[PDB]
Design an enzyme around this catalytic site. Sequence first.
Site, mmCIF file in Angstrom:
data_model
loop_
_atom_site.group_PDB
_atom_site.id
_atom_site.type_symbol
_atom_site.label_atom_id
_atom_site.label_comp_id
_atom_site.label_asym_id
_atom_site.label_seq_id
_atom_site.Cartn_x
_atom_site.Cartn_y
_atom_site.Cartn_z
ATOM 1 N N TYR A 1 38.314 46.732 45.466
ATOM 2 C CA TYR A 1 38.073 45.470 44.813
ATOM 3 C C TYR A 1 36.960 44.657 45.521
ATOM 4 C CZ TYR A 1 38.758 41.235 41.987
ATOM 5 O OH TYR A 1 38.637 40.152 41.173
ATOM 6 N N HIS B 1 42.444 35.044 34.690
ATOM 7 C CA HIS B 1 41.010 35.401 34.578
ATOM 8 C C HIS B 1 40.734 36.465 33.539
ATOM 9 C CE1 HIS B 1 40.944 33.339 38.359
ATOM 10 N NE2 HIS B 1 39.658 33.576 38.567
HETATM 11 N N1 CDP Z 1 35.401 43.545 42.123
HETATM 12 C C1 CDP Z 1 34.836 42.340 41.950
HETATM 13 C C2 CDP Z 1 35.160 41.296 42.815
HETATM 14 C C3 CDP Z 1 34.528 40.066 42.630
HETATM 15 N N2 CDP Z 1 33.651 39.860 41.595
HETATM 16 C C4 CDP Z 1 32.942 38.560 41.415
HETATM 17 O O1 CDP Z 1 32.710 38.109 42.760
HETATM 18 C C5 CDP Z 1 33.170 36.781 42.937
HETATM 19 C C6 CDP Z 1 33.629 36.594 44.367
HETATM 20 O O2 CDP Z 1 34.818 37.361 44.529
HETATM 21 P P1 CDP Z 1 36.203 36.764 45.041
HETATM 22 O O3 CDP Z 1 37.200 37.863 44.854
HETATM 23 O O4 CDP Z 1 35.985 36.370 46.450
HETATM 24 O O5 CDP Z 1 36.236 35.513 44.003
HETATM 25 P P2 CDP Z 1 37.352 34.546 43.284
HETATM 26 O O6 CDP Z 1 38.629 35.243 43.634
HETATM 27 O O7 CDP Z 1 37.153 33.115 43.851
HETATM 28 O O8 CDP Z 1 36.789 34.554 41.903
HETATM 29 C C7 CDP Z 1 34.224 36.599 41.854
HETATM 30 O O9 CDP Z 1 34.441 35.252 41.478
HETATM 31 C C8 CDP Z 1 33.655 37.413 40.697
HETATM 32 O O10 CDP Z 1 32.735 36.653 39.921
HETATM 33 C C9 CDP Z 1 33.406 40.927 40.730
HETATM 34 O O11 CDP Z 1 32.623 40.782 39.798
HETATM 35 N N3 CDP Z 1 33.973 42.132 40.930
#
Ligand code: CDP
Lengths: 291, 277
Positions: free
Chosen positions: A247, A265
């Site tokens: 991930y 989401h």
């Molecule tokens: N496997 C993934 C993980 C994150 N992301 C993107 O990367 C951003 C940063 O990841 P995060 O897991 O720290 O973000 P949030 O949990 O705050 O959205 C996310 O908000 C998504 O827009 C993605 O496109 N694919």
Amino acid sequence: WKFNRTAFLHQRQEILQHVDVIKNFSLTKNSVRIGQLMHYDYSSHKYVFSISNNFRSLLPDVSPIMNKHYNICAVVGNSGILTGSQCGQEIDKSDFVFRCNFAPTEAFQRDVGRKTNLTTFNPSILEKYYNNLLTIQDRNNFFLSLKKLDGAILWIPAFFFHTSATVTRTLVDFFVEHRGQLKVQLAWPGNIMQHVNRYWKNKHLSPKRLSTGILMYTLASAICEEIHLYGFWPFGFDPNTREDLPYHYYDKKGTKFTTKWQESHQLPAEFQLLYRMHGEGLTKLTLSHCA
Amino acid sequence: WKFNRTAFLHQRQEILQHVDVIKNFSLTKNSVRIGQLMHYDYSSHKYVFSISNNFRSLLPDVSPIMNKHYNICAVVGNSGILTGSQCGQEIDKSDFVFRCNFAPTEAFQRDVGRKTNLTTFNPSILEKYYNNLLTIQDRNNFFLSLKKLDGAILWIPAFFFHTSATVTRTLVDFFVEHRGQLKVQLAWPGNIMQHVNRYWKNKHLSPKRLSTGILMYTLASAICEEIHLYGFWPFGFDPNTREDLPYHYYDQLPAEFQLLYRMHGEGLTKLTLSHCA
Ligand SMILES: Nc1ccn([C@@H]2O[C@H](COP(=O)(O)OP(=O)(O)O)[C@@H](O)[C@H]2O)c(=O)n1
Ligand SMILES: *[C@@H]1O[C@H](CO)[C@@H](O[C@@H]2O[C@H](CO)[C@@H](O[C@@H]3O[C@H](CO)[C@@H](O)[C@H](O)[C@@H]3O)[C@H](O)[C@H]2NC(C)=O)[C@H](O)[C@H]1NC(C)=O
Ligand SMILES: *[C@@H]1O[C@H](CO[C@@H]2O[C@@H](C)[C@@H](O)[C@@H](O)[C@@H]2O)[C@@H](O[C@@H]2O[C@H](CO)[C@@H](O)[C@H](O)[C@H]2NC(C)=O)[C@H](O)[C@H]1NC(C)=O
Ligand SMILES: *[C@@H]1O[C@H](CO)[C@@H](O[C@@H]2O[C@H](CO)[C@@H](O)[C@H](O)[C@H]2NC(C)=O)[C@H](O)[C@H]1NC(C)=O
Ligand SMILES: *[C@@H]1O[C@H](CO)[C@@H](O[C@@H]2O[C@H](CO)[C@@H](O)[C@H](O)[C@H]2NC(C)=O)[C@H](O)[C@H]1NC(C)=O
Ligand SMILES: *[C@@H]1O[C@H](CO)[C@@H](O[C@@H]2O[C@H](CO)[C@@H](O)[C@H](O)[C@H]2NC(C)=O)[C@H](O)[C@H]1NC(C)=O
Ligand SMILES: *[C@@H]1O[C@H](CO)[C@@H](O[C@@H]2O[C@H](CO)[C@@H](O)[C@H](O)[C@H]2NC(C)=O)[C@H](O)[C@H]1NC(C)=O
Ligand SMILES: Nc1ccn([C@@H]2O[C@H](COP(=O)(O)OP(=O)(O)O)[C@@H](O)[C@H]2O)c(=O)n1
Ligand SMILES: *[C@@H]1O[C@H](CO)[C@@H](O)[C@H](O)[C@H]1NC(C)=O
Ligand SMILES: *[C@@H]1O[C@H](CO)[C@@H](O)[C@H](O)[C@H]1NC(C)=O
């Protein structure tokens, strides 16, 4: 892939019609009153937070992105697609780099870069990673983390989730105590999600909650002439090789993909829209190793 | 039971020669600096709390108990022995009443009285009873609770246990926000347990930790002519029938109890273990 500047500037203008990005980017001193009660974008209305003298004292006087212009911007999401990509040099060539959730770079620079000009910071980081700044060592570790950011913007959304409330006081007190010792530029968005949600609702993306990555895209649109996205890939396999991916890029090798968020989401729906935007030349989505 | 004023005056003098009670009662504005790191009496040294401008602003200018002298004082512990005691009227006849941990009186007045001149307040009370002041209703409920105290002292020990740290910022912010709206007199002891322990160590009581009750006795010894104790009975069973009693009336303590019982027998203080009427 070929940039279409006209269509990107049109997107910018459309975003700006729905979201005053320069203002929404951060509360400023003169926009809040001492004693004002804030509510949370994503919690029940009963949850409140009173703005103190000390909180207000950490707000910028003017929007930190007012009259700022950056030509090439990188927005770095956290996908496991970045591991092994070697995108770090290309990311760091950008004029300005946005990162999400105080993501680590130290072990990963070759893939994700070391340049940071903004990073987002949920207050609950202090709970998860710095033990609520209870000890000398906690305080020192957090202080060092901040010092490594130099003059970057730390973009702290304290009014999204009510569970931020009590840790926000600790964070505010830490910054007041250390006033003038760090160069980090503090930014504190208020209740902006309803405004941001409007733009994306018109594009047929309406999850309960927009991801940090797309929120950063929205901000970037106003101040960047050209946006390159990295680490946006919410899937457990590499698009080119078909190998299993975690991930997050900072997950250890062999970590099985499991989705961080369910229900709240729609990361695949975000990705699809961004992929369409890539195809229209609005932004460059990178999905492969960097030259 | 007959008071031995002589022996009590001797005890007072001994306590005062070991513990500066008037100073130890509360930090004052001028005794802390902004940015000073406090440590906790009962936690590891690594735990710290930085004194802010706002915290300092809530400290008294001068010890609230300087040059105060009261005749009869009641110190009211929270034992379930008070249920059915009918000690309320006798407690309220005291010149000055000390209570522990913001204990409720309204529904229990017949047994515990409604007079309060000081009540102690562990910050964690906000967590247990007021939901960290997260909602409007929580804030109102806490405000109303404070208003019912009128001009009493709220004695808040924020530096005994490190687990007070984060709630203490919430409490501080609430009081700054409401500055001038309440008459409660705030007091904030600092790192006093090692000084208080000295007197009691010589009386062969040296736990880990002294209880709030005996800490209140100590403070009382400096400002009271005579001290009457209620609700000190750290046992789950009625002293006479041996039927279950709750820990609290609103539901090493045994060594403390034994010492206070010996003190009762010497006429130093009056320990009430039975109905008043
Ligand atoms: N496997 C993934 C993980 C994150 N992301 C993107 O990367 C951003 C940063 O990841 P995060 O897991 O720290 O973000 P949030 O949990 O705050 O959205 C996310 O908000 C998504 O827009 C993605 O496109 N694919
Ligand atoms: C985030 O940006 C949005 C706009 O995208 C801000 O909402 C806007 O807030 C201003 C307040 O100055 C509103 O302006 C007012 O408009 C009315 C007419 O509708 C006028 O009578 C007033 O004199 C004033 O000009 C504007 O209506 C409002 N827009 C929307 C769509 O609500 C919001 O304040 C920003 N939030 C933060 C926390 O920065
Ligand atoms: C702002 O950037 C544009 C685009 O720069 C190109 O694309 C970037 C992603 C990166 O790879 C750059 O190194 C590329 O040069 C600049 O427009 C280019 O300018 C160069 C140098 O003068 C010129 O040779 C190219 O033909 C131009 N390319 C395009 C697509 O226009 C622009 O000059 C930059 N402006 C400033 C002030 O930095
Ligand atoms: C850049 O994007 C714009 C906007 O999508 C493109 O302009 C469109 O061109 C098609 C061509 O058939 C028309 O149907 C649209 O109505 C046009 N819209 C506008 C506002 O011009 C443009 O073609 C793209 N440029 C390049 C070089 O691909
Ligand atoms: C964006 O942030 C980077 C730091 O990540 C800034 O680049 C540094 O700039 C300093 C001061 O000029 C140099 O001494 C360092 O060598 C640079 N470091 C790196 C990693 O490039 C950059 O200036 C910032 N850009 C802005 C604010 O537009
Ligand atoms: C509590 O009272 C004691 C005295 O009973 C104070 O202890 C003195 O503190 C000063 C200043 O630190 C020392 O130089 C003296 O040696 C101490 N005396 C003794 C007998 O230990 C103590 O500072 C007071 N504490 C508070 C928080 O009020
Ligand atoms: C100790 O506290 C009580 C309140 O609990 C004070 O008694 C009150 O005094 C006010 C003002 O004179 C009266 O209007 C109330 O009716 C009294 N209430 C009760 C329950 O007696 C008392 O004055 C305080 N004593 C000292 C020495 O400060
Ligand atoms: N059953 C009880 C309950 C309380 N007490 C005393 O009453 C004080 C107030 O009770 P508490 O349990 O609210 O106090 P803490 O010692 O927990 O701060 C205690 O410190 C004890 O001295 C007692 O002797 N017997
Ligand atoms: C009062 O206490 C002192 C000190 O122990 C003792 O000598 C004196 O006889 C006591 N008086 C009594 C019990 O009446
Ligand atoms: C103190 O209380 C006692 C006992 O009730 C009482 O008789 C005496 O008059 C009071 N006043 C003084 C000044 O001692």
